[PDB]
Amino acid sequence: DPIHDRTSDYHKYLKVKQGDDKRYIWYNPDPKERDSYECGEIVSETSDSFTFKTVDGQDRQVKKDDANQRNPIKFDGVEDMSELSYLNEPAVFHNLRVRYNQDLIYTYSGLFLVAVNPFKRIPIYTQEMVDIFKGRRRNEVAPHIFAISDVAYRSMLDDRQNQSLLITGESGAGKTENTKKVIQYLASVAGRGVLEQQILQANPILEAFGNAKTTRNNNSSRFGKFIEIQFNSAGFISGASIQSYLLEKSRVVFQSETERNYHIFYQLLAGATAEEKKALHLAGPESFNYLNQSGCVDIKGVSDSEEFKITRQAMDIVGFSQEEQMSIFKIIAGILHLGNIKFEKGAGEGAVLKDKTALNAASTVFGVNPSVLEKALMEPRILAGRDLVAQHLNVEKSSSSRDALVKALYGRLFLWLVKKINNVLCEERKAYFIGVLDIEGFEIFKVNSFEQLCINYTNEKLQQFFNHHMFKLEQEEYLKEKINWTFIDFGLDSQATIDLIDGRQPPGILALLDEQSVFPNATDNTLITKLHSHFSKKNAKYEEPRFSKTEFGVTHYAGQVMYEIQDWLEKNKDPLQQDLELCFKDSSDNVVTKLFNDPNIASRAKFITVAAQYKEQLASLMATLETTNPHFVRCIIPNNKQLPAKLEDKVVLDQLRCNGVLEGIRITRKGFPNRIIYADFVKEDSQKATDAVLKHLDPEQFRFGITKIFFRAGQLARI
Numbered sequence: 084d085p086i087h088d089r090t091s092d093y094h095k096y097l098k099v100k101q102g103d104d105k106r107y108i109w110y111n112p113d114p115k116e117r118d119s120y121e122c123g124e125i126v127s128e129t130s131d132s133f134t135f136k137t138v139d140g141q142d143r144q145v146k147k148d149d150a151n152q153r154n155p156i157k158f159d160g161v162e163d164m165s166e167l168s169y170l171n172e173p174a175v176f177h178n179l180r181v182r183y184n185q186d187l188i189y190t191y192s193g194l195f196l197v198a199v200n201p202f203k204r205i206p207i208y209t210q211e212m213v214d215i216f217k218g219r220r221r222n223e224v225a226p227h228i229f230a231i232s233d234v235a236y237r238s239m240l241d242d243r244q245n246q247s248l249l250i251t252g253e254s255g256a257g258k259t260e261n262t263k264k265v266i267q268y269l270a271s272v273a274g275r276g277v278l279e280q281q282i283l284q285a286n287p288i289l290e291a292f293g294n295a296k297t298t299r300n301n302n303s304s305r306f307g308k309f310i311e312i313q314f315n316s317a318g319f320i321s322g323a324s325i326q327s328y329l330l331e332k333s334r335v336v337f338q339s340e341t342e343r344n345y346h347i348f349y350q351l352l353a354g355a356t357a358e359e360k361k362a363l364h365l366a367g368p369e370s371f372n373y374l375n376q377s378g379c380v381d382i383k384g385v386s387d388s389e390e391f392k393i394t395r396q397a398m399d400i401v402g403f404s405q406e407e408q409m410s411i412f413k414i415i416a417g418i419l420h421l422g423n424i425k426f427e428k429g430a431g432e433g434a435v436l437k438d439k440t441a442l443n444a445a446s447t448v449f450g451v452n453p454s455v456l457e458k459a460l461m462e463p464r465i466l467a468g469r470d471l472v473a474q475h476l477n478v479e480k481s482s483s484s485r486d487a488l489v490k491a492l493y494g495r496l497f498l499w500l501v502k503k504i505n506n507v508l509c510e511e512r513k514a515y516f517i518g519v520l521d522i523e524g525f526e527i528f529k530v531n532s533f534e535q536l537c538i539n540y541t542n543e544k545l546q547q548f549f550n551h552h553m554f555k556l557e558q559e560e561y562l563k564e565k566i567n568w569t570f571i572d573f574g575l576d577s578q579a580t581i582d583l584i585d586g587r588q589p590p591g592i593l594a595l596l597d598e599q600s601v602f603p604n605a606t607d608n609t610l611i612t613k614l615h616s617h618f619s620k621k622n623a624k625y626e627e628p629r630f631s632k633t634e635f636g637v638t639h640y641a642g643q644v645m646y647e648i649q650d651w652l653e654k655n656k657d658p659l660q661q662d663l664e665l666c667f668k669d670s671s672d673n674v675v676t677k678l679f680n681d682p683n684i685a686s687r688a689k690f691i692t693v694a695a696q697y698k699e700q701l702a703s704l705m706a707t708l709e710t711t712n713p714h715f716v717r718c719i720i721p722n723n724k725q726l727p728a729k730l731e732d733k734v735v736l737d738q739l740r741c742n743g744v745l746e747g748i749r750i751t752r753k754g755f756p757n758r759i760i761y762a763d764f765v766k767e768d769s770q771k772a773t774d775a776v777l778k779h780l781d782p783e784q785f786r787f788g789i790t791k792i793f794f795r796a797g798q799l800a801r802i
């Protein structure tokens with residue numbers, strides 16, 4: 084029994100090792116750097132302040148309700164931060180750091196599982212590790228993604244209720260790795276198996292087409308996902324379903340320095356056989372504009388040819404036909420060829436295509452007519468007035484249209500891959516489900532565009548959902564034992580920002596964006612002007628900048644975010660010339676044809692803008708989450724260098740402020756956080772027996788209940 088054998092890998096890798104007076108505080112040696120603390124010993128006090136000795140042996144003073152008291156050393160490495168007497172920033176970080184120093188990357192903080200990326204392998208995900216967590220309560224085993232997974236599974240079986248695990252945090256923090264562990268765990272504890280294996284193999288497929296090397300993560304997820312693992316009433320896996328969100332289609336046509344395009348492009352060019360290579364007119368990455376601009380074509384530690392074998396293997400297991408696999412690769416190759424089309428200026432303003440090589444190669448692989456494609460690109464017919472007239476586009480517009488075609492192809496293909504996978508995995512009458520959400524947390528970059536607003540909008544709703552969940556839990560517990568606290572549902576605090584974004588009346592940002600989009604005469608400038616007209620000095624969550632004419636600020640839960648408006652109209656309409664649509668609807672390829680003829684893939688439904696679709700999909704997601712018992716995982720990146728053993732105070736503390744753990748862990752401290760059953764406290768009339776152990780020593784520090792005794796912050800600690 085590894086849990087009781089101190090020599091087990093369990094004890095070594097998941098527990099603080101077990102063998103056979105004065106007060107301190109955390110202070111800043113430099114008051115400008117609020118996150119760099121040292122430990123100072125308190126030596127004296129007045130009533131409104133402390134005096135402590137710094138490391139450089141000095142004497143300073145600070146107010147009492149400003150002091151960051153250090154918890155007693157015995158608490159260093161505690162598994163649940165709910166046990167800490169003090170929950171100030173430095174204290175919370177200190178406990179995370181003591182654990183991290185011991186390669187203990189998982190820690191609870193109330194409802195949250197906090198997971199700090201180790202950036203090295205830690206052997207805690209083997210089958211033996213899996214077996215240990217089966218059936219164990221959270222407080223019976225060490226913190227681990229497997230423990231939250233198990234707790235969810237048992238809750239599903241015991242309560243006959245659907246569950247969700249929300250795994251968030253910034254890019255590179257560990258969301259996807261932890262999501263994969265959840266799926267591994269469920270697969271093992273609830274599996275047989277062909278199905279289990281098909282479920283596991285869906286991942287590699289999606290990651291090949293949806294992930295890419297960015298500066299923050301060698302394997303960054305460029306789309307969000309909600310994975311529904313389905314179970315029959317006996318508790319065995321019966322199916323799965325995947326919903327994808329906000330695929331970064333722009334990456335296909337542009338990548339920042341040192342970043343890569345999606346993995347699949349490199350897998351194909353490196354793993355294709357001689358036959359395929361000549362048959363798809365392939366070459367090295369350096370010969371494709373869509374792959375030769377960033378300066379990076381490889382990832383240290385990754386073999387694209389090997390990965391390609393893994394990808395094909397996953398495709399076989401899931402059941403993609405050889406013909407379907409070939410067509411998928413034809414689409415990937417065609418996109419690269421489209422990227423190599425060089426438009427040049429003609430006699431007039433109209434672009435021309437001198438060399439037909441890439442056009443023909445693309446047209447050959449896609450199975451479309453090159454003459455029809457060339458015209459669709461350079462001379463699309465537009466409905467001007469009552470006349471349908473072919474317009475001759477210049478180099479810029481021709482290039483942009485080509486890029487639009489590429490993004491539409493990649494986006495539609497990804498959607499098709501997801502639906503194909505769902506066709507194999509989905510139940511179709513499932514009894515219960517455990518849903519896993521793997522999406523980015525709040526994003527605040529140097530430049531924030533429409534995609535950031537969308538993700539921040541999602542996070543506002545998820546944060547509100549968390550706060551409302553807490554309110555309900557506490558309200559129920561208090562109203563159960565009858566115990567007068569009036570607390571406010573902090574979820575209400577999120578409504579103003581949410582309304583600013585998605586409100587109908589008065590119209591919010593998305594509604595104004597839609598209004599500017601589906602009617603003529605609008606530009607980025609008319610759009611930003613309208614937003615200012617509606618919200619500047621009129622909505623408390625909005626800010627018109629002092630100088631910029633193209634940005635606006637929104638006060639989000641995690642801070643103000645400044646958005647730039649460039650291209651929002653285009654992003655919201657996501658246009659593709661009808662002649663291009665017509666061009667590809669005639670494709671001879673079996674997959675290409677679905678991408679343009681199946682309305683479930685070719686069209687947003689009845690149009691609707693991108694913002695409206697996003698709003699609807701998020702509302703559907705929230706409605707599903709509301710029917711579940713939720714579990715929360717906060718992934719934390721230790722630094723911005725992808726290095727192990729380097730837990731950077733500033734980097735970590737910022738994430739703790741913006742993800743809700745600092746705020747959340749304190750909410751319970753308002754009122755009576757500790758509640759213990761009478762009989763368990765005394766160890767006849769339990770109530771009186773307790774009234775007597777307490778009276779043997781301030782009644783205001785406690786409020787008896789119907790089954791438990793309620794203590795105020797720190798009181799239980801004193802006893």
Ligand SMILES: Nc1ncnc2c1ncn2[C@@H]1O[C@H](COP(=O)(O)OP(=O)(O)O)[C@@H](O)[C@H]1O
Nearest residue numbers: 200203204253254255256257258259260300302
């Ligand atoms: N628990 C972990 N153990 C080992 N490596 C990890 C772990 N979690 C994160 N990784 C490392 O960090 C990288 C990024 O993690 P990932 O889950 O892709 O981040 P996100 O999905 O939050 O953008 C991984 O590819 C891996 O190298």
Ligand code: BEF
Nearest residue numbers: 254255300303304
């Ligand atoms: F880059 Be991680 F997927 F957010």
Ligand SMILES: [Mg+2]
Nearest residue numbers: 258259303304
């Ligand atoms: Mg990811």
